[PDB]
Amino acid sequence: GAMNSSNYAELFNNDIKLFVDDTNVYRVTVHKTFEGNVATKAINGCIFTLNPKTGHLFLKIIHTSVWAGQKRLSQLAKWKTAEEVSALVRSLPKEEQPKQIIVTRKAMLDPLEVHMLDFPNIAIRPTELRLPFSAAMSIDKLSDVVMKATEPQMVLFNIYDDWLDRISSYTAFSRLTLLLRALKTNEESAKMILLSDPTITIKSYHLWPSFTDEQWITIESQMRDLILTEYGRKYNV
Amino acid sequence: MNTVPFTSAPIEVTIGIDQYSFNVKENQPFHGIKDIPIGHVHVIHFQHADNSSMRYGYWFDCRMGNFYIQYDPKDGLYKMMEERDGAKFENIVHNFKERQMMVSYPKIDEDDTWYNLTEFVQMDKIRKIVRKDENQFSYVDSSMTTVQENELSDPAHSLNYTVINFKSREAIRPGHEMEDFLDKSYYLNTVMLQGIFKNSSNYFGELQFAFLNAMFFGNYGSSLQWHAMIELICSSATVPKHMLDKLDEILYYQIKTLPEQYSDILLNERVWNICLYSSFQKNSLHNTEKIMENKYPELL
Numbered sequence: 001g002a003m004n005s006s007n008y009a010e011l012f013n014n015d016i017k018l019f020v021d022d023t024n025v026y027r028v029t030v031h032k033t034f035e036g037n038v039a040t041k042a043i044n045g046c047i048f049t050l051n052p053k054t055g056h057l058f059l060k061i062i063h064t065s066v067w068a069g070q071k072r073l074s075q076l077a078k079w080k081t082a083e084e085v086s087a088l089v090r091s092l093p094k095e096e097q098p099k100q101i102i103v104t105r106k107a108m109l110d111p112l113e114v115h116m117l118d119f120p121n122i123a124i125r126p127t128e129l130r131l132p133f134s135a136a137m138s139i140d141k142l143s144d145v146v147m148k149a150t151e152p153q154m155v156l157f158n159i160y161d162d163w164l165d166r167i168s169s170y171t172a173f174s175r176l177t178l179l180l181r182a183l184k185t186n187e188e189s190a191k192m193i194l195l196s197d198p199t200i201t202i203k204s205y206h207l208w209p210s211f212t213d214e215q216w217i218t219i220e221s222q223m224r225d226l227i228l229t230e231y232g233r234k235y236n237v
Numbered sequence: 238m239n240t241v242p243f244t245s246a247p248i249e250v251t252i253g254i255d256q257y258s259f260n261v262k263e264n265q266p267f268h269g270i271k272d273i274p275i276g277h278v279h280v281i282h283f284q285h286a287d288n289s290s291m292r293y294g295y296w297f298d299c300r301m302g303n304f305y306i307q308y309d310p311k312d313g314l315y316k317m318m319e320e321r322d323g324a325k326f327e328n329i330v331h332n333f334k335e336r337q338m339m340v341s342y343p344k345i346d347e348d349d350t351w352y353n354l355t356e357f358v359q360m361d362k363i364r365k366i367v368r369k370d371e372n373q374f375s376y377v378d379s380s381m382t383t384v385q386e387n388e389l390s391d392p393a394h395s396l397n398y399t400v401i402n403f404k405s406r407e408a409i410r411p412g413h414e415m416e417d418f419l420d421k422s423y424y425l426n427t428v429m430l431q432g433i434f435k436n437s438s439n440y441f442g443e444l445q446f447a448f449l450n451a452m453f454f455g456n457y458g459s460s461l462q463w464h465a466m467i468e469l470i471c472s473s474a475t476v477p478k479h480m481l482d483k484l485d486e487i488l489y490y491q492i493k494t495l496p497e498q499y500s501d502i503l504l505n506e507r508v509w510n511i512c513l514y515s516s517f518q519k520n521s522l523h524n525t526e527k528i529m530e531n532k533y534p535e536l537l
């Protein structure tokens with residue numbers, strides 16, 4: 001059924017699964033027209049598709065040209081997501097296809113189920129968790145690759161960099177969501193925290209800096225202080 | 238005018254004949270039902286005074302044989318039978334009619350209700366949905382499951398309605414996923430109408446038979462079928478005009494007939510608000526919508 005805090009460890013078992021987050025697929029800027037009316041200018045998007053076990057991110061770049069001439073774009077976006085996820089499954093060798101796909105928004109259930117009717121043995125599931133994957137476009141290299149794209153393009157990342165050499169995937173996942181939650185709540189402060197120390201660099205093949213274990217502890221703590229903070233600044237507590 | 242004679246009524250029971258029902262008392266001198274309008278399909282149905290559990294009854298056409306009801310005390314029910322000796326059935330039925338032991342099918346002459354409810358219902362089709370080929374009548378009860386309900390257990394006692402599933406490969410063409418889920422026209426017109434039903438009259442007949450088994454027997458799987466075949470039209474942006482107009486007539490009479498006190502279990506709130514207010518056909522069922530708003534504004 002649905003995924004929640006009780007069956008939280010199932011994300012890290014050896015059953016292949018993918019999270020799909022569709023919140024950044026259809027992105028616009030809203031602006032005034034010369035006539036003083038309002039209009040949207042779409043910008044490039046991405047589908048955020050992640051194996052939480054391995055850290056593998058299949059970042060499907062959605063160029064604005066896919067919206068040309070289409071109506072009801074927000075609806076089409078969910079169908080476009082489903083089609084792309086389904087094309088991703090079909091292109092993977094069988095022993096690589098997921099046994100479950102978790103959608104971070106319930107509205108994607110039916111589009112994906114309909115696109116995956118050929119894969120009856122793949123469980124399409126919702127989740128109760130409030131995952132911050134929407135903040136993915138606060139990761140500079142990812143954002144950069146979406147915004148530069150001139151055509152439809154799929155790009156492969158490991159969202160955990162080399163973390164799994166030193167920590168488990170449960171802990172990797174928890175670090176990730178804590179960073180993304182922080183970026184989502186106060187992007188500037190979050191970004192300030194991650195780069196305050198110019199001696200800690202991001203390898204060319206990574207997304208996040210090369211922190212020691214002790215430095216990640218310090219980092220993780222500052223991100224919690226931030227999230228707790230903004231929760232006060234927000235609710236006055 | 239034709240007759241369903243009864244050998245006796247050993248057990249107290251509420252008999253229904255079409256939209257009519259009357260109480261028979263245990264061992265009351267009752268010998269049956271007379272004056273049954275030729276030319277329609279009929280249902281004669283039972284609810285025992287002692288165990289309201291299990292409504293049951295028989296679909297029949299009088300043109301298709303001479304039919305009597307006799308209580309079986311081993312199986313504990315009123316059973317329909319056929320008498321092939323036509324001479325014998327005439328003389329048996331005449332004797333009960335002379336002794337005035339039969340109630341009369343009480344049709345009001347202004348009343349087209351039964352016709353508007355069975356317009357596309359044909360015995361030959363009923364017998365394919367209800368498979369028991371050695372009899373010319375067809376038995377139903379509240380607990381028979383449908384073929385689709387058995388996929389989600391006895392196949393001989395099932396209701397073989399047409400399977401309709403909006404998220405199936407049958408319903409969705411590769412490459413038209415979003416198109417075909419949001420506008421079910423392909424599935425209504427090409428798959429079901431042209432492919433399986435052949436025409437709209439076969440489709441409405443199953444729809445009407447579905448509905449009557451829900452109403453008369455509280456058969457849940459027939460209600461599911463009745464609703465699905467509504468939703469499939471209402472969700473198709475392209476429907477022949479004559480089907481919409483006939484659909485508005487069909488449903489309207491179904492809504493009018495439905496017991497006021499049974500709407501909470503027979504009417505799917507979601508399907509009906511979708512069909513009348515959201516769907517492609519939200520403006521095409523004026524009669525059905527006006528009756529539904531005036532009789533069951535709560536559901537909406």
Ligand SMILES: COc1cccc([C@@H](N)CO)c1
Binds near residue numbers: 242243245306326
């Ligand atoms: C009560 O009606 C009928 C009709 C035909 C035949 C018979 C006989 N089997 C006697 O029960 C009865």
